[PDB]
Structures are given as C-alpha cells and as structure tokens.
Amino acid sequence: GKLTNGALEASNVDLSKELVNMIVAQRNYQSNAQTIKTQDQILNTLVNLR
Amino acid sequence: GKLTNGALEASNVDLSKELVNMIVAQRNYQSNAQTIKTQDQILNTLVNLR
Amino acid sequence: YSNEQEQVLGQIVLANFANNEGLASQGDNVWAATQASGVALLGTAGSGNFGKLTNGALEASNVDLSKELVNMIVAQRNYQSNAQTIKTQDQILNTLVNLR
Amino acid sequence: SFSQAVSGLNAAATNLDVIGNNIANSATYGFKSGTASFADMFAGSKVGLGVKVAGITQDFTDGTTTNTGRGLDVAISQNGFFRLVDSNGSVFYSRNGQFKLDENRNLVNMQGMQLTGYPATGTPPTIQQGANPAPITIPNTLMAAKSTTTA
Amino acid sequence: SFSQAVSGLNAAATNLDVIGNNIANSATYGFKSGTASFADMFAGSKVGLGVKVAGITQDFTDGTTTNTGRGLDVAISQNGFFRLVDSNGSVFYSRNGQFKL
Amino acid sequence: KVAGITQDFTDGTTTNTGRGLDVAISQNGFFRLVDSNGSVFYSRNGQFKLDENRNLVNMQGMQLTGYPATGTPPTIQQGANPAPITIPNTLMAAKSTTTASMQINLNSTDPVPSKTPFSVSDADSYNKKGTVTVYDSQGNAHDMNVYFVKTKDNEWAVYTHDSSDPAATAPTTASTTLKFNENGILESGGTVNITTGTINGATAATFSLSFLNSMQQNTGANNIVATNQNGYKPGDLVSYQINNDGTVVGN
Amino acid sequence: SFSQAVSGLNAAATNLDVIGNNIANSATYGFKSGTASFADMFAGSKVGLGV
Amino acid sequence: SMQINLNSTDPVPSKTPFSVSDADSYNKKGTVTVYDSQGNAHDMNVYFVKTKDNEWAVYTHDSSDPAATAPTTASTTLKFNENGILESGGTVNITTGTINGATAATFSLSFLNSMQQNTGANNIVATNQNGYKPGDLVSYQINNDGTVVGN
C-alpha cells in the first residue's frame, strides 16, 4: 500500500446503488411469487376438473 | 465451532419454502381425494347393475 | 509492474460455433459443445465472427420479465382450456355411458 | 379423445416451467432466456392428434451491459463464448464474466472453473497464437531485467 | 414446476439481506461491501431448475479516506491489509485503523 | 356424413420476436422444406435454425430449400430449381479491380505548376494529388496515387503511381490527359486501362480507370467528390440477414 | 389478445429506457438525444395487431 | 482433411533452418487428432513454413509418439496460383507412429479448397477425420424409417 496517518477509510458502499438494487431484488422476488401462485392455480384447475 | 456471546440462533425454517410445500402437499392430497372419488363411483356402477 | 513496464500474460480466447442453439447447457452458467452444436472454432476479440469485449462491465441477463409475465398468463389460460376440453370429453363420455 | 388435451397440458406445463426458470434466472449474469417450440401431431386420420414440444431453445440476443467498477468482470457483446475448463480437464463454454483469482493465481470463475487463453512466452512475451489454449496464470513472477540495447 | 420459482425467491431473499447488510453496514469505517452472485442449475432435461447462489463475494476497491483529527487513524489507500493477533495467538487481517491504545 | 376437415388459411397475428433467424410470412404463401428422405414438404413455421453443416433447417432438422446464389456476382440460374441453402464460413475471396472511377472538380483559376518536369517528390509539379486503393488478382492493397497537372487552358495531365510498389518507378511518361470543352464538361481522355504494380507473388491489377462526371470548377479547390471500385480484401464472415423479400445476405 | 398488449408493452419499455438513457447522459459532452420511432403492425386481417 | 486459409503476406520465418520446438521456425502450427487400429489418439502437428511467394513447405510431426524422429524432409508442399487456388501437393499420404504396442496409422491428408488470404493470419477453417475412439453405449434410438440405431 501507501499509508496515511490522519485519514481513516470509509465504507465501500455507494448506497444509491444498494438502494436501487433492493428494488430490483424486491420486484424479481414478487415475480417469482407470481409464478408460484400461477403454478398453484394451474394445479388447482388440474385437480378440480373431475 | 465458534460460539458467540449475545446473539441467539434463529430458526431454520425459511417460511417461503414451507408455504410452497404446503401448496404442493395439499394439491396432491386433493388428487388422492379424486382417486378415492373415482373408486367410489366405479363401485356404485358395479353395484347398481340389477 | 513496479518498474512501470507491462508484459502480456495471455489473451482470453473466445469461441464460436456452427449454431448457438445446439449448445447443451450444463449445470451452471456453462454451456457445452455437442454434435448438434458443431465443434467450436476459436479465436480472439474482434476477428471476423467474434465478439467485441469489455473490461469491467458485466453482462446482465437477457430476460424481460414483462414478456415473461405476459407469457405465463397465456400459458396459464390455454392450460385451463386444455383442462376444459378433457372436462367436456369426460362429460360426453359420462352421458355416453349411462344413456342405456 | 383425451390425447390432444393431455398433450396440451404437458405442453403448457413445460412452457410454464421454462418461463418460471427464466423469471427465476433474472439478474444472474450471463443467463440466456428460455424458449419453447411446439409442433402438432398427425397421422393418416384427417383430424389432429395434439401437440408435442419440438424442443427447448435459448434466446441468443445480447443482454444489457452493466458497468461495474470491478476490473475482473470481463464481459463480451457479440457471438463469442468464453472457453472454460474444469478440474477434470473438460472444456466448457460460458458468458458469465464474474472472475475470481484462486490461490494459485489463475483466472477462475466464481465456481472455480479455470479460463483458457493463448499463452504468452518470451521476453517480452507476445501472443503465442498457435491455436493451443491454456489456463491463464497471472502470477507474481518477477519482471526479469534485461539489457539496454538501443539507447 | 414450482422449485424453480422458490429458488428464485430465496435467491432474491439472499440479494435482499446482503443488500440490507450493506445498507445497515453503511458509514462504518473499513467495511468492504458484499455482493451476491448467482448461477442457473440444469440437468439432463433442457428445461430448468432455478437459480442458486454462486457465492457472496466482496468488492475490494478502496473506500474514500476521510480526514479525521485523531492521530491514530491509519488507513491503506491501496491493496494492503493490516495484521492482528489476539489473546489466542491467531492471525487476523483488517482494513480500518481505529487504533486505540 | 362428415364431409371433411378443412383448414382455414387466414394469417395469424405476426409477433415481433427479437431473434434474427425467425422469418415468417403473413399471406397465402408456403415455406418449402425437405427432409433427409428426399421428399419435399411445405410449411409455414418461422423457427429456422441451422445445423452443424450450417444449412438452414426448421426445428425438426428439415432443410429449407431455396433458389441458389450462383455466379460472381452470385445470382439465380436458368434451370429454376431450388436447393438446400447454406451459410458457409468459406471466406469471400477477393477479385482484381476492374472498374475504378474517380470524379474530380478542379478550379479553372489554378495556375500552371511551376517546377517542371514532373516529380512525385515535388508538390509544386502537380496541382492535385488523389488516392484510390485498388486490389489485384490475389487482392492486396495498392494505394494508386493519381496526379493532376494543368498544362494549359482546360487541359490537365493525369499521372498514375503505385505507392504500394517499392519496385515501381516514378511516372514520367504521360498516363492520360483530361481535355475539357469550353463549358467545363469532359470531352475526351476520361478512361484508361491502367496496370498496377506487382507485389509479393501477387500479379498486378489491370483495371479500367474512369474520370466520367468530372467537371472543371471556376473558383474553388481541386476536389475529389466520388471514388468507387470493385476491388476488396478477403472478408471471412461477420453476420447475415434474411432480407425482407426473402433472400439471405451475408455481411 | 395478448399480442397487441405485449407489442405495446415492449414499445413503452424501450421508449422508457431510451429516454432514461437521455436523462442519464444529460450534460455529458457531445451526447445526442435519442427518440424511439414506432410503427404499427398489420397483416391480412383488417383489424390491427400491434406496434 | 485440414482446410486452412493462408496469409500471403507472412514473411519467410527468421529462424532458419526448420525447428520443431522453436516457434519462430515456422509460420503456423496446427493440430489434427487421428486414430489408429488400436484406438489411441495421435496428435499430428502440421507445421507451415513459407518458402517463397505462393508455396509453403508443409512438415508433419507425430507429437503423441515421443520416440519419433524430428522431420527434416518435406511432408508436402502447398503450391498456389495468383488467384489463391491450390495447385499441387494438396493431398498426401502419411504414416503415423506406434505407441503402447499399437499399429501404425496411415491416412490421406487433404488440403482441398485451401485459399491464400491476402491480409490476416493463418487460421484453420475445417478439419475432419474418420478415426474415432471406442465407445460402449450412451443412447439408442428407433428412427422413423424402421432403422434402429445406437449412439
């Protein structure tokens, strides 16, 4: 490295990118919820046909 | 392994995986209900010959 | 390096195929070549049929979940219509049996 | 009678499985989209006999490209493929550029499969493009000093 | 049919809690962020199996060194790590210099 | 009595698919296919892949049949019989330049070049330097410098020199001469069968250079507006398209 | 049906990401604005079928 | 057969005479894997050197036979015209070596439709050979023409 004595290192996060990445995680979580609920209701009509 | 001080060990269950497992368990329960249903009505079409 | 001269340590080989569609995808982001894929011809970035590369930028997935979300409901509704044609096949056989 | 619609149910079930895979594989880098391909059965009978899945294919467009400051995230945008090798020496191909170093300082992906490159031999090395790929070792090997010839 | 989507669910949950870590871990000194990385599973079938974590890998670019009036506040602005031993003699490596006496 | 099961042949909704090799018609036409059995079949599906032999097939491997690309330039033949069409990685071979033309607009107010006789190392011996990059029978680069020298009123000496040939000599004998009318329109001298140099076992290009559509400006600069030729480099392959009227083109 | 809707839905998606690119490259020197020009779909049926 | 496009502007290599181990003694190295009557893989390295304009000394080496002699004679010579059309020496018979008590494989190597590229590098277009490993079984299929097959 090359050390400095007065200055102390802050974090590595750029929390704009984290706060916009949690939204993409939220929405593809919700779309995965959409496909489990649609496999639920196709299996629902696969039962109740008689 | 590395025991910790004040943190508790929270539960193993990830409740999304169980909320889809109850869906698939209840719908093949319903499929088993349909095969006892068809066994019921093939038995009464075996009975009501005479 | 520390004397500020650089030396080449290798070059990332790219590979193309006869068709991309014959690639049998293995159990990762990995694909694997087949008889159906054609044997892979190899080269570097920018020569003929080959890929212009980037340095730090990473390639995201190509799925558009708007088209995925609108395809799941059309697969869902024609699934239910297939359920209803076996349903009415059941009803016409039911009134075919017990007519006497 | 029933064969048409049980074929249709199997077709829509494979279709839903493919697109549920595609929704699940959103935002995994290098994933290419799934697509189903269907075709109808026939025979000597003039009526139709359902639908078979003629095959599952991929969609080979380019994804969008996200600029990450990490320098070991090399991606490509055209028809090429990274040529990886595993621990068993089997050749594979991929487009996920999330590349680690391992202990031995040769470029693995985040699974551990090593890249392949045309090696560079000499002093100073050039592209020894003899069509012979090899895992890209990027060592801490010292820069061997050479003599001045033209000042 | 269903396992692909619950694989997508817990993959997005792994995204969401490592991002909630990094947001909760924001503006501490000498933390270096985490990053979830994924990969698709496949089998003999050409249809899919969902998504798993390939791993939680950290980014090792430098945080912005902030001026602080305390003198015991060293920080590397490059690719070195500190070295720490404990009361049990095990080696450990750090990046912040919150160095009290 | 069931009289028979009829198809209906109205076109379905054409769906915009971002894939490239997915061509589907919307009229009463029919794609033509063949399988390996040798029987010709007719379809309408747009899913078109290519094999490991890189001939365009459907999803079931049945090869598309099309009108061939025969000749140089590749065109249709007078037997009119379709065939399985391929997309090869066989490289586009170069052919010698045969027709090159350069159009020039020279000011008529330009004085006669002073430093006579002509030299290629003397800028004041000519009025205008131009460049046309032609390619020979094997097809390597030849940067033919053409040279424009005002001899007198409306008459322009035109010199040719292969800069790519280190074994060539300087032009000192006249290649041709543009002679213009009173109106500034080219009268004669607007064509020459000019031969390039010979380099590294590739024999020289012997091409028709033309200066048609040139005209003498009255005040301005000596300006080349349009060069064109039919010589080129060996291109291997980059990409390909299905054109909108059916044919396939290869970049 | 769903075809006009998906065609339409995409049109708006590509228009949104192009004008997001125009907002993102604001005050980047020498950048040029981009507009997504669209065009409607027709076939042998009299009713329109997308964009 | 090995079909390959040859750079016409490649110089005569500076390392003279020929060497099998030294990279600058040849214009381009290529590899074809051939197979014998026993079934072992022989990695035939083809070495392209240019002699003068429009013809190439083609030397062959059996690198999978470690007890093999280094070639100092011409395996063949690729002769080209002014248009890059192959002229003569485009098909040559060649014997391989033996190892592990196997039999020697002798095959006809074909360079047909090899073109001489003006500007570029030497790149292998298409190789194909009819030798193959032993194979036990993976699949077996009932094709529609009443023909049963194994793969």
Residue numbers in the entry:
A (entry chain F), B (entry chain L): 353 to 402
C (entry chain K): 303 to 402
D (entry chain K): 1 to 151
E (entry chain F): 1 to 101
F (entry chain P): 52 to 302
G (entry chain E): 1 to 51
H (entry chain V): 152 to 302
Show sentences the authors wrote.
Bacteria swim in viscous liquid environments by using the flagellum. The flagellum is composed of about 30 different proteins and can be roughly divided into three parts: the basal body, the hook, and the filament. The hook is a relatively short axial segment working as a universal joint connecting the basal body and the filament for smooth transmission of motor torque to the filament oriented off-axis of the motor. The model of FlgE consists of three domains, D0, D1, and D2, arranged from the inner core to the outer surface of the hook, just as previously modeled.
Here we report the native supercoiled hook structure at 3.6 Å resolution obtained by cryoEM single-particle image analysis of the Salmonella polyhook. Based on this cryoEM map, we built atomic models of FlgE for 26 subunits that cover more than two turns of the 1-start helix of its helical assembly. The supercoil was left-handed with a helical pitch of 129 nm and a diameter of 33 nm. Accordingly, the subunit conformation gradually changes along the circumference from one protofilament to the next due to the supercoiled nature of the native hook structure, although the conformations of subunits are nearly identical within each protofilament. So, although the conformations of the 26 subunits we built into the map were all similar to one another, we identified 11 distinct conformations among them, one for each protofilament. These 11 distinct conformations are all realized by slightly different arrangements of the three domains but the domain conformations are well preserved. When the two subunit conformations in the shortest and longest protofilaments are compared by superposing the D0 domains, domain D1 shifts up by 5 Å and tilts by 4°, and domain D2 tilts by 24° in addition, in order to achieve an overall subunit length extension of 14.7 Å. Thus, the compression and extension of each protofilament during the smoke ring-like rotation is achieved by changing relative domain orientations of FlgE while maintaining the conformation of each domain. The bottom of the C-terminal helix of the upper subunit axially overlaps with the top of the C-terminal helix of the lower subunit to allow their mutual sliding for protofilament compression and extension. The D2 domains form a six-stranded helical array on the surface of the hook by their tight interactions along the 6-start helical direction regardless of the protofilament length.
